[PDB]
Amino acid sequence: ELSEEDKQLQDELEMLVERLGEKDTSLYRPALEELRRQIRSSTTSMTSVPKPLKFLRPHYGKLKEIYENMAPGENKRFAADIISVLAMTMSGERECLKYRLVGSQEELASWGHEYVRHLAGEVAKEWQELDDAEKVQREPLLTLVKEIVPYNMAHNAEHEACDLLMEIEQVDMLEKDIDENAYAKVCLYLTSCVNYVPEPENSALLRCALGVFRKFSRFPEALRLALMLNDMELVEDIFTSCKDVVVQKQMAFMLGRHGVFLELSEDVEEYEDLTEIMSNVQLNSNFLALARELDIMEPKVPDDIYKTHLENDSARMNLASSFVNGFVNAAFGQDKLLTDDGNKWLYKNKDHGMLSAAASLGMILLWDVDGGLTQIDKYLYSSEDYIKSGALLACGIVNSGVRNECDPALALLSDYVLHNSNTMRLGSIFGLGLAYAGSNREDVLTLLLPVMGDSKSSMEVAGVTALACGMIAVGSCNGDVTSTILQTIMEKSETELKDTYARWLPLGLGLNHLGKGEAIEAILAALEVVSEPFRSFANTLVDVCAYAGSGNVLKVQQLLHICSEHFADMGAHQGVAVLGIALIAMGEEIGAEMALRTFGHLLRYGEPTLRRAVPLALALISVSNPRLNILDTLSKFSHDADPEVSYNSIFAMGMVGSGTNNARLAAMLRQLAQYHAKDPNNLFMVRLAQGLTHLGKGTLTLCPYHSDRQLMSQVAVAGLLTVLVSFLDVRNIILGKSHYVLYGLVAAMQPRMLVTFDEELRPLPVSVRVGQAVDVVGQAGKPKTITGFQTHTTPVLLAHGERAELATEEFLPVTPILEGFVILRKNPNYDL
Amino acid sequence: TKGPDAASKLPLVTPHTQCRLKLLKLERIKDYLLMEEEFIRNQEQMKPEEERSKVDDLRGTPMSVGTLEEIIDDNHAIVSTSVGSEHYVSILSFVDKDLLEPGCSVLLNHKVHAVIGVLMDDTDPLVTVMKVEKAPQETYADIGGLDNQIQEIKESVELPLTHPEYYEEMGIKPPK
Amino acid sequence: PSTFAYPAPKVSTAVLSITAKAKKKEKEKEKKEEKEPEPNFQLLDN
């Protein structure tokens, strides 16, 4: 029951509700004033159950009707406030919202935080239920979001504040209400919510959250988002708006790390430095610089990696020998086998063996158009000039991941892209694609145009050719290149398609359409002309390339259906389908970790063609990421009976452990070698897996994600896709004549380091507490984003999923996210 | 070595403030889960014999489980019935004369006791419930303090599985 | 009223996250895209 206070309050409210029975003059103004006080007093209190609302369980029918008759002026409105507040406790939303809509205005703050939020929900609920059929109701609701949103901004309720605007579909106002003490909370939230949000709201959020970064002059943060939307114009403005050269310098280093090039006008000061920084010429000096501090300049040899001592010269295994002396010593600037006696080494490889070995010569020395190009002066012109493709890939590979003002790739390669010999051309187009991947340069794209139409070119020349064009125009949907690809793809004949290398033609179509699912509706329309199977296959694969990293559950559901189907011309469509889920889902950690379960189900409940793709699919999900659960999953299928699954699982292990130097993966890899010693095909690739797991002695990562895993690297996602899909048929492609395709990864090959330099670029060894990154979203205050701290004296290495923070407040980094090369600005606030 | 049958933990949704970031992340987990159910169910439905069917006819139903004790000949072994008796049953062809090991739990024909199948994974129900399937939900960030105690318990049960190189590169055997 | 005698001759999963939003947006895209003389007088032989 109640007490003297409670029972009396029940009567006092009871008298007030009852007295409104008649139309007495001193019953409407007097009573409604009392309800206004008591209801306001309790509701604007601690979370105490609003005694007025608990006692007041009356019906508004009498007052709602007389509301109209009883003084439609102020006396009418007053009743609305009392009934409206009583509505929030009950379930009368439509009426509960529309009372504050029509009733007395006053102000939202006067009622109570609990009331304000409830109106927030209903306002969002009504706005969503209100379509474009009429804005007449929108102006009032829009007016409400004008006042309430400022209410949340102050009250630590930015989450509801951002949540409130997102519900309305319109989030402009945050620009005008965010305080210097709030942009971090709001800007972080949108970046975290943007990935999950579907099209097109997700795109709108990125720009808006990007905009908020603008209003408070946090320029480097605007950079990360600008690329996330993958729109160059907003990048160019920030490039232009950055009146501070230092911020200009840094935002170029993030522009470069993404592989994004914007033609810099000479009006911009330090154009060469910005051009050289953007061209990534300074990368080589650091990489060698990084090595000297780390003491890893000495090159390695295959025998030590394999550890032949512990285990209880065919041309193939020589290739695996040749490859491991690639990746493992790649980018170190010196190899002990491919630089001194190479003519001797290659001569024990028959044709395609020569191709692979020669190409590794360029990958052994990346990012040196001079040193590598000078380490490119003893083979290519071989008595078996067939290996010319080998150095041509090395020629193209060296230019991959960098841009030189002298355009070496086109010069050397062009004279041989028309070379009649089929093998000579394979290196030309492929190597060229690596060098200018994502460049989208019209010249090289144009020069690659005749390659498509050159009928004399063999299909293997063609398949690489379309792939080469795709890798250049990755993520730009280049109308000319797409047209060339789109025009070229249609002209293909049915009989010539049935070959495996025709599997590469659609790949080039997508690689042009990576990251833009809006424009791929048309591209899938044009492809419908060609007849199946490759019509359906290209449709799926083109479909996947459209949604690279979108996080679109819809496409994944669409993609999962294709894999789910149980049918040979249908299995190519399936295999690209499973790899489809891997690419689409690999943006967010929440979804990506879930795709593992789906991948696992596709293996126990899968079929021949699917079971081969799953081992590859896991490869893209966790590239350079030795998650134990995934690495274990590849192993338990690393011995499988089907040769294709055994190979793909072994390759996946190599990718997952790429550059991680994971001891367990190595020990796991070594044991497999002993198990599969008999079969050269397994032993070759298990040996290869050990090769990928030591990429750059671990000083590189093929992960396509930078910027706290947020900023996607378009050119990268092109590479992994080529090898992975090309691995969809390993025996014809991998085990066949196309050992060179493994060089497709070189596009995404990037360094992972923590070298800290002083403001003058001298290495400034700063205590950097580096550990597993922990999200700061939704954590009030200054949450620690690093856990499992292990103070390292920079330079340092960050295994994937790690973040480094400057443990000394002596400096204030220009860019908030400490990845790659960061300009540490000495803190003016710090006092010794 | 069946491999680690690790627990099955759904990813974690944080923020916890009950904000829309929370709803979206739970939805994403649900979306894939709804998708994952779709594949399991749509794999049995979309999914629409003369060698095994002959085998199952020789075995019949049911099939006893006693303990092998001696492989007398290649085609004869002595199997102890589930009561502690003995039997000089015959080893049929379909059985693998490799997995047949003294002490193994053998599947026996019911009418004419004859080794018909080797029942690996016969671990007691009393120890097969001892295995944790659904991983508990308290992450190292739910335990406050105990940084000196946690590290001591993370250098014997977690690190020795992730970075084995450190220990074997130094001569220790990971504390166990 | 008529003639007689001689007779005769998966599931869409909810995915409620964005299923409806895509479908409601898809419909909008759809809008953008946009015997009295019978037998019983049977002429039958004997």
Side-chain angles (χ1 to χ4, degrees), chain A, chain B residues 1-164 166-176, chain C:
Chain A
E1 47 108 26
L2 279 39
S3 87
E4 52 275 354
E5 312 277 355
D6 275 347
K7 193 54 49 144
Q8 268 49 31
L9 244 183
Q10 180 183 1
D11 297 328
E12 309 155 25
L13 278 293
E14 158 77 20
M15 155 174 313
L16 274 288
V17 46
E18 281 294 357
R19 285 173 49 259
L20 299 146
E22 61 157 344
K23 283 68 56 187
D24 191 7
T25 301
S26 63
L27 281 181
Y28 296 164
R29 276 292 186 177
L32 291 173
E33 277 154 7
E34 190 63 5
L35 289 202
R36 198 118 168 182
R37 216 205 74 64
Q38 303 291 29
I39 273 188
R40 279 270 184 72
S41 66
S42 284
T43 279
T44 36
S45 319
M46 275 261 267
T47 178
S48 173
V49 54
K51 269 192 275 202
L53 282 141
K54 166 196 155 180
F55 304 145
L56 289 187
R57 280 324 212 180
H59 92 301
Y60 70 91
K62 68 150 179 179
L63 292 169
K64 183 34 53 192
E65 60 94 31
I66 190 157
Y67 171 108
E68 318 138 12
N69 330 93
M70 162 260 276
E74 288 331 315
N75 266 346
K76 140 179 288 172
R77 315 213 171 183
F78 259 38
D81 302 358
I82 307 315
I83 319 163
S84 100
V85 162
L86 201 158
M88 48 96 89
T89 281
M90 256 287 106
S91 178
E93 166 212 7
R94 279 295 76 81
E95 289 97 350
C96 176
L97 180 153
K98 72 175 173 22
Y99 274 40
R100 171 72 207 203
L101 151 73
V102 297
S104 172
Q105 276 313 335
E106 187 69 349
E107 64 182 10
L108 290 104
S110 74
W111 290 114
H113 204 311
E114 301 85 52
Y115 176 77
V116 176
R117 165 197 282 81
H118 207 306
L119 254 293
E122 298 184 358
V123 168
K125 298 209 126 220
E126 195 38 14
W127 189 280
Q128 304 214 309
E129 192 200 342
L130 168 50
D131 304 1
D132 271 280
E134 57 154 317
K135 288 71 173 183
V136 199
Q137 313 172 347
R138 261 186 181 90
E139 307 113 351
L141 308 191
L142 199 186
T143 53
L144 281 173
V145 308
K146 290 296 142 294
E147 341 300 332
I148 170 184
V149 180
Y151 188 81
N152 294 337
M153 282 344 272
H155 281 157
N156 302 348
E158 315 137 354
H159 293 2
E160 313 149 3
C162 260
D163 280 8
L164 191 53
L165 305 161
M166 279 157 37
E167 288 335 323
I168 311 163
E169 338 310 319
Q170 173 265 331
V171 64
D172 173 26
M173 311 86 78
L174 224 59
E175 308 263 70
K176 135 192 74 52
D177 210 300
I178 295 180
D179 221 333
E180 293 84 310
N181 321 265
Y183 92 123
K185 315 211 148 59
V186 65
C187 284
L188 179 83
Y189 194 100
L190 300 193
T191 278
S192 269
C193 215
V194 277
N195 298 141
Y196 306 85
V197 154
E199 280 313 337
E201 277 243 353
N202 64 46
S203 300
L205 289 138
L206 326 158
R207 20 197 178 255
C208 176
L210 188 179
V212 171
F213 268 146
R214 287 321 320 120
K215 247 187 126 179
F216 284 166
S217 46
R218 277 278 65 188
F219 289 68
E221 297 78 18
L223 205 54
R224 316 244 167 171
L225 281 291
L227 298 151
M228 299 174 160
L229 212 182
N230 292 297
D231 218 359
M232 190 34 48
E233 32 276 56
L234 318 98
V235 179
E236 153 278 323
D237 283 356
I238 310 164
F239 207 111
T240 320
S241 295
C242 260
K243 334 265 184 160
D244 183 356
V245 82
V246 179
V247 187
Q248 183 54 100
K249 282 178 183 171
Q250 200 33 27
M251 75 158 258
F253 251 116
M254 254 296 168
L255 249 201
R257 194 41 41 101
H258 192 300
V260 169
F261 218 68
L262 47 87
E263 56 103 341
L264 187 44
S265 307
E266 223 42 49
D267 73 334
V268 172
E269 276 192 328
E270 298 188 349
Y271 157 85
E272 316 290 17
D273 206 44
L274 292 164
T275 325
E276 70 92 9
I277 284 169
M278 282 215 297
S279 63
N280 189 263
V281 313
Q282 163 65 50
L283 165 156
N284 163 334
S285 88
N286 326 278
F287 207 112
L288 284 210
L290 169 58
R292 85 195 63 260
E293 312 104 352
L294 279 50
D295 285 8
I296 48 155
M297 274 275 230
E298 193 262 8
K300 323 307 296 298
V301 195
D303 205 333
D304 58 51
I305 298 314
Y306 306 130
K307 173 188 276 288
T308 51
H309 328 76
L310 201 144
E311 287 101 19
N312 179 202
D313 306 351
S314 185
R316 168 180 312 298
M317 22 165 64
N318 286 230
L319 330 165
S321 302
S322 64
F323 276 66
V324 155
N325 273 356
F327 298 128
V328 151
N329 299 354
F332 283 105
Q334 56 199 38
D335 166 36
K336 278 184 173 169
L337 269 283
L338 195 35
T339 54
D340 294 350
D341 272 327
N343 298 356
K344 159 152 293 188
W345 186 358
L346 330 172
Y347 284 3
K348 63 204 169 80
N349 299 334
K350 59 138 283 305
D351 248 17
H352 315 330
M354 311 275 318
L355 193 47
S356 309
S360 166
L361 271 147
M363 152 196 62
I364 278 176
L365 271 274
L366 307 97
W367 298 322
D368 53 351
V369 176
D370 307 343
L373 270 299
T374 58
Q375 295 237 46
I376 297 315
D377 66 1
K378 204 191 47 58
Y379 311 78
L380 167 28
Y381 265 176
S382 165
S383 44
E384 177 196 357
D385 50 1
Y386 161 108
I387 90 167
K388 293 209 189 180
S389 42
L392 292 208
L393 313 172
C395 285
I397 199 165
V398 163
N399 283 302
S400 75
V402 282
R403 284 211 211 171
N404 274 195
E405 303 201 344
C406 308
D407 181 282
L410 186 170
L412 191 134
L413 280 283
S414 58
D415 289 341
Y416 281 42
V417 287
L418 62 143
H419 199 311
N420 216 28
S421 194
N422 281 335
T423 290
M424 314 318 135
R425 190 173 296 175
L426 259 53
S428 305
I429 56 176
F430 196 19
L432 189 68
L434 299 128
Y436 289 159
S439 307
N440 284 252
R441 294 251 310 281
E442 300 186 354
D443 46 351
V444 177
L445 290 169
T446 45
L447 176 150
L448 277 278
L449 304 185
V451 192
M452 344 288 297
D454 180 18
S455 175
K456 159 266 163 187
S457 300
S458 45
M459 200 46 38
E460 103 271 1
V461 167
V464 175
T465 281
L467 186 119
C469 292
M471 280 202 353
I472 273 154
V474 285
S476 68
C477 281
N478 268 13
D480 161 33
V481 189
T482 301
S483 55
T484 308
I485 296 169
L486 159 77
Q487 300 335 81
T488 326
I489 56 193
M490 197 21 55
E491 59 108 22
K492 316 317 310 182
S493 147
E494 186 201 359
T495 36
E496 294 159 322
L497 289 164
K498 209 182 174 198
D499 58 2
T500 308
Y501 288 37
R503 155 83 59 58
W504 294 356
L505 289 154
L507 193 185
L509 190 165
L511 274 187
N512 202 195
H513 306 303
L514 322 160
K516 325 262 173 219
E518 291 189 357
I520 270 291
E521 279 50 44
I523 275 277
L524 47 92
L527 255 284
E528 206 174 358
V529 194
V530 78
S531 100
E532 290 171 15
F534 295 80
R535 174 200 289 159
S536 45
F537 178 90
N539 161 287
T540 59
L541 201 153
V542 299
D543 214 355
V544 83
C545 270
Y547 302 75
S550 73
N552 203 307
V553 46
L554 271 83
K555 255 317 161 190
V556 177
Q557 183 174 230
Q558 258 145 23
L559 256 47
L560 169 151
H561 292 147
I562 316 135
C563 323
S564 67
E565 173 266 333
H566 176 18
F567 56 71
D569 281 327
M570 151 52 219
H573 320 335
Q574 298 184 160
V576 278
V578 152
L579 210 70
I581 290 206
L583 179 43
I584 293 169
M586 71 164 261
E588 297 76 59
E589 317 80 348
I590 311 304
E593 181 188 7
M594 211 75 58
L596 302 186
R597 296 158 65 71
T598 302
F599 288 158
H601 283 19
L602 268 59
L603 273 206
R604 185 167 120 106
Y605 298 108
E607 68 181 352
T609 325
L610 317 158
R611 165 171 310 239
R612 311 148 187 279
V614 167
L616 314 160
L618 286 162
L620 223 60
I621 295 313
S622 280
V623 192
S624 147
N625 179 0
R627 204 141 41 250
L628 261 279
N629 44 19
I630 170 181
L631 264 190
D632 158 49
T633 281
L634 306 170
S635 179
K636 215 181 69 55
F637 305 111
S638 77
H639 295 254
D640 199 353
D642 170 12
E644 196 100 20
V645 46
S646 100
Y647 308 141
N648 280 342
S649 304
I650 282 305
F651 184 36
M653 277 176 164
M655 302 275 308
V656 154
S658 40
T660 59
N661 323 54
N662 184 307
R664 153 171 280 290
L665 177 34
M668 225 174 331
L669 278 185
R670 297 177 203 290
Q671 272 189 355
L672 297 171
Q674 149 188 50
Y675 178 87
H676 292 277
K678 285 334 213 174
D679 166 66
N681 288 348
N682 267 311
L683 183 33
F684 152 65
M685 256 189 32
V686 181
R687 261 192 154 201
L688 177 78
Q690 280 221 104
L692 270 296
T693 193
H694 283 47
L695 256 174
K697 300 170 195 165
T699 36
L700 322 166
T701 73
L702 327 175
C703 300
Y705 284 49
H706 195 66
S707 172
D708 202 304
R709 312 327 172 172
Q710 275 271 286
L711 169 148
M712 187 177 197
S713 147
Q714 183 44 290
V715 171
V717 165
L720 295 74
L721 226 36
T722 89
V723 185
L724 265 307
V725 303
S726 66
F727 260 95
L728 284 153
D729 181 347
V730 311
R731 325 154 316 295
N732 318 44
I733 304 313
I734 303 300
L735 292 167
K737 316 326 157 284
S738 96
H739 322 313
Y740 59 79
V741 49
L742 249 69
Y743 293 104
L745 305 212
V746 174
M749 295 221 211
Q750 286 286 350
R752 152 51 72 205
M753 78 312 294
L754 206 40
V755 197
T756 53
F757 305 121
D758 214 343
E759 293 197 320
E760 173 264 15
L761 287 162
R762 273 181 212 120
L764 155 80
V766 167
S767 70
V768 286
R769 172 156 61 271
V770 172
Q772 285 71 80
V774 175
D775 207 352
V776 71
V777 186
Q779 288 190 23
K782 302 170 183 181
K784 277 189 170 185
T785 83
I786 286 182
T787 62
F789 70 90
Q790 278 184 1
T791 54
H792 320 283
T793 174
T794 57
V796 197
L797 268 51
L798 328 183
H800 153 242
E802 296 322 4
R803 194 141 40 60
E805 64 78 28
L806 63 160
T808 58
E809 56 210 348
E810 202 62 72
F811 306 83
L812 309 164
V814 202
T815 295
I817 320 86
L818 296 52
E819 288 184 6
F821 308 118
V822 298
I823 308 173
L824 290 189
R825 170 171 295 159
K826 287 175 183 156
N827 184 355
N829 161 277
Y830 192 113
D831 259 325
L832 269 283
Chain B
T1 61
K2 270 210 40 45
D5 275 13
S8 34
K9 58 181 68 53
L10 249 202
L12 165 66
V13 45
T14 50
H16 279 335
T17 156
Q18 218 140 11
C19 46
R20 186 169 197 260
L21 181 48
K22 196 168 182 179
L23 166 54
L24 269 275
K25 298 172 94 170
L26 286 170
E27 202 92 318
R28 169 59 54 92
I29 310 169
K30 181 241 192 64
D31 301 354
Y32 274 90
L33 258 206
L34 278 183
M35 240 188 71
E36 180 180 351
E37 188 170 33
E38 203 165 19
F39 177 84
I40 307 175
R41 197 161 307 183
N42 295 359
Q43 156 264 340
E44 184 59 47
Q45 303 160 343
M46 151 55 58
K47 227 299 300 178
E49 60 182 21
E50 305 172 353
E51 329 170 11
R52 316 215 83 177
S53 293
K54 302 308 142 298
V55 171
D56 313 321
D57 206 337
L58 302 197
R59 322 176 116 176
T61 88
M63 309 181 345
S64 294
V65 174
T67 87
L68 203 56
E69 305 220 350
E70 167 29 59
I71 316 186
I72 292 296
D73 203 338
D74 185 35
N75 316 354
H76 280 28
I78 271 171
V79 314
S80 153
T81 279
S82 305
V83 182
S85 68
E86 298 220 288
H87 286 96
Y88 181 61
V89 303
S90 46
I91 327 284
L92 272 291
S93 93
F94 34 103
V95 152
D96 192 2
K97 284 90 172 182
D98 307 38
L99 316 180
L100 226 48
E101 303 207 21
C104 75
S105 274
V106 313
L107 285 156
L108 310 165
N109 181 347
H110 192 216
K111 289 185 172 180
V112 183
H113 286 211
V115 152
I116 274 188
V118 57
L119 195 46
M120 333 155 291
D121 158 12
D122 191 7
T123 278
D124 303 68
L126 288 181
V127 169
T128 324
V129 60
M130 274 189 204
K131 205 183 315 309
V132 152
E133 269 79 317
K134 284 204 63 43
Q137 200 188 5
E138 315 218 19
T139 88
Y140 277 172
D142 196 296
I143 52 180
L146 298 182
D147 201 309
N148 304 353
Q149 294 98 342
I150 286 161
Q151 186 173 36
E152 270 157 310
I153 168 76
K154 194 162 201 283
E155 294 172 350
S156 67
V157 316
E158 210 280 9
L159 246 60
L161 295 140
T162 70
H163 301 78
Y166 294 175
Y167 304 86
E168 101 169 341
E169 153 211 340
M170 167 85 24
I172 313 194
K173 194 72 61 63
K176 185 165 28 180
Chain C
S2 61
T3 64
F4 51 70
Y6 253 83
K10 323 148 37 194
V11 196
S12 189
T13 40
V15 192
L16 83 175
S17 45
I18 38 185
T19 187
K21 198 296 196 287
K23 286 173 81 71
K24 84 208 214 174
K25 176 74 60 62
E26 188 41 64
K27 303 319 275 217
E28 224 199 314
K29 299 168 241 146
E30 288 313 315
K31 143 178 71 36
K32 315 166 179 102
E33 310 314 310
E34 312 320 295
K35 288 179 179 180
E36 26 201 4
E38 75 183 3
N40 90 326
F41 331 113
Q42 283 103 353
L43 186 154
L44 331 172
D45 225 344
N46 321 97

